[PDB]
């Protein structure tokens, strides 16, 4: 899908060139920057959501501890 | 995973394309992801996944335009790996950047300035954010900076600039900008830097004006839309925080064995908050009815405003003196929504909207025509009339009628194509046969031959007042329809009256007294008292054989203002002008520069001087000038024009 995204950007630039509008070169450095941004976004969204997922998972067995107290 | 893929693909790419191209790219990526069975949430807006409420509010305080394109641009500006290159012809982006980074003492610079390098070193030494306003004349010393050619030697983060070594500070950041929206950059440039396109398009200005009128008008319903935002940002926030507070209070686990599980009250509060948020989502479904209504009612206003601004933009073709910046049109909009005397006594939403659109058209014309030649006022009035005609719903498009009215002369005829009607000249016969090509005018020859009042009307002094009803139609026409039909008849029939008749046409659309303000003398007192900023210069462009000094000298005399008037002929004149401007910027007096058309380059430098200057409230710089193309385009765009 990432490769397709790069190729689609190339196709869009080519179509804009055909239509006569201003086009701007899409170097592979753009692909490197895209991969780095994907890494950063994925890492930060994971470091937030999965962290609070760990909190939720601890709570999920906290309820079982309360069940243990109820059984007692 | 899919959400982050799409968001990163939009951040890295799509930084140069307009709104439609960004949407098309996002749609193509989403369609491919759906083809690949990759799950990505569709409901979220890309402008909301990558942004927080607090930073968005800070941006709003930093005068970030409410445009979705501008929101995405701000997001790209906050999160980046390559230093941004801001393409802002409007000029809003520079203000937004300075407001956002004012706490970090951002420094302005330009590549043409010699001190730039030194400032750069300071930006590299103290780690202060820096903005460059002109990078068309690139100086490649940033190539190590853009490439981040860092060297980690000992505890030193170091870069090679020229033949010198300067230590990096992580707090440092550089922001390149170009005012020119059509400049082409070499491939290395588009590789090193990411682009942040700020050009204002049709959809961009439509959305911006829609949001502006949404905030300004229906302030209670503006607060209702704010509450739409709140239920996502407060009711949801209260729900989740009360959930976490419930969880902590139960996590206390006090009183072992003893039944301390009184958390049920917090459970009830959780259910109340959850039902509140679900009912507020149902209220957003109502928004798909009510706030959507508040948006669609003003949609014609924003569409007409975008059309108006781009009509002003394309007005630059017909004359080199018709240069209007976007800030001028936004000032017109703010003077329409706010500080409008016609809205003081009206509270109903529909009447307020109609009055606002009427004042929009009127004030736009009355501001544009003041710096516009008398032979062209009718042209701009006709353009605004066509804009309002497109705005009206029940009225037909009249596309064929206007197309013929503008391109009749391109139709090729023949000698036999003219029946040589008695009482009609050869050119009039050609006009008759060309106009007869239309369906509503097919029987024109028969009416021409049969009619007898034609002979008096054709030679009448003012035929346009009493145009006979020739064109045959199945159903009665609108008054504006009658106006355009008679306009075509006049154009084909007595083109000399055309100009004059054009006036009546606009009077049929925009009111009889639409141009009524053009005829009075220019009331300079209210013009300079309000509605013009002290930074903005007052340009008085007069045709040769006329001087505008007397009007403004009388203006200064009647307002009891000590005005310093200087002619621009020599370097001594330059020194006196600079000294007077530096005195009056702080003292508050009025200053005058005569015949500034003699020095175009110094005019460019003066414009650059006023750009970075906050003057006194009473400061007024008048530039009296002759109408010649030598005058810089930037001064014309950065100043109010008077003809």
From Swiss-Prot, chain B:
Location of the protein in the cell: Cytoplasm, Cytoskeleton
Tree of life domain: Eukaryota
Annotated coiled-coil segments of the chain: 234-297
Region (AAA 6): 502-643
Chain positions covered by the region annotation AAA 5: 50-279
Family: Belongs to the dynein heavy chain family.
Disorder: Charcot-Marie-Tooth disease, axonal, type 2O: An axonal form of Charcot-Marie-Tooth disease, a disorder of the peripheral nervous system, characterized by progressive weakness and atrophy, initially of the peroneal muscles and later of the distal muscles of the arms. Charcot-Marie-Tooth disease is classified in two main groups on the basis of electrophysiologic properties and histopathology: primary peripheral demyelinating neuropathies (designated CMT1 when they are dominantly inherited) and primary peripheral axonal neuropathies (CMT2). Cortical dysplasia, complex, with other brain malformations 13: An autosomal dominant disorder characterized by global developmental delay with impaired intellectual development. Some patients show signs of peripheral neuropathy, such as abnormal gait and hyporeflexia. CDCBM13 is associated with variable neuronal migration defects resulting in cortical malformations.
Subunit relationships: Homodimer. The cytoplasmic dynein 1 complex consists of two catalytic heavy chains (HCs) and a number of non-catalytic subunits presented by intermediate chains (ICs), light intermediate chains (LICs) and light chains (LCs); the composition seems to vary in respect to the IC, LIC and LC composition. The heavy chain homodimer serves as a scaffold for the probable homodimeric assembly of the respective non-catalytic subunits. The ICs and LICs bind directly to the HC dimer and dynein LCs assemble on the IC dimer. Interacts with DYNC1LI1; DYNC1LI1 and DYNC1LI2 bind mutually exclusive to DYNC1H1.
Function (record text): Cytoplasmic dynein 1 acts as a motor for the intracellular retrograde motility of vesicles and organelles along microtubules. Dynein has ATPase activity; the force-producing power stroke is thought to occur on release of ADP. Plays a role in mitotic spindle assembly and metaphase plate congression.
Free-text note on domains in this protein's UniProt record: Dynein heavy chains probably consist of an N-terminal stem (which binds cargo and interacts with other dynein components), and the head or motor domain. The motor contains six tandemly-linked AAA domains in the head, which form a ring. A stalk-like structure (formed by two of the coiled coil domains) protrudes between AAA 4 and AAA 5 and terminates in a microtubule-binding site. A seventh domain may also contribute to this ring; it is not clear whether the N-terminus or the C-terminus forms this extra domain.
Protein name stated in the entry: Cytoplasmic dynein 1 heavy chain 1
Organism: Homo sapiens
Lineage: Eukaryota, Metazoa, Chordata, Craniata, Vertebrata
Gene: DYNC1H1
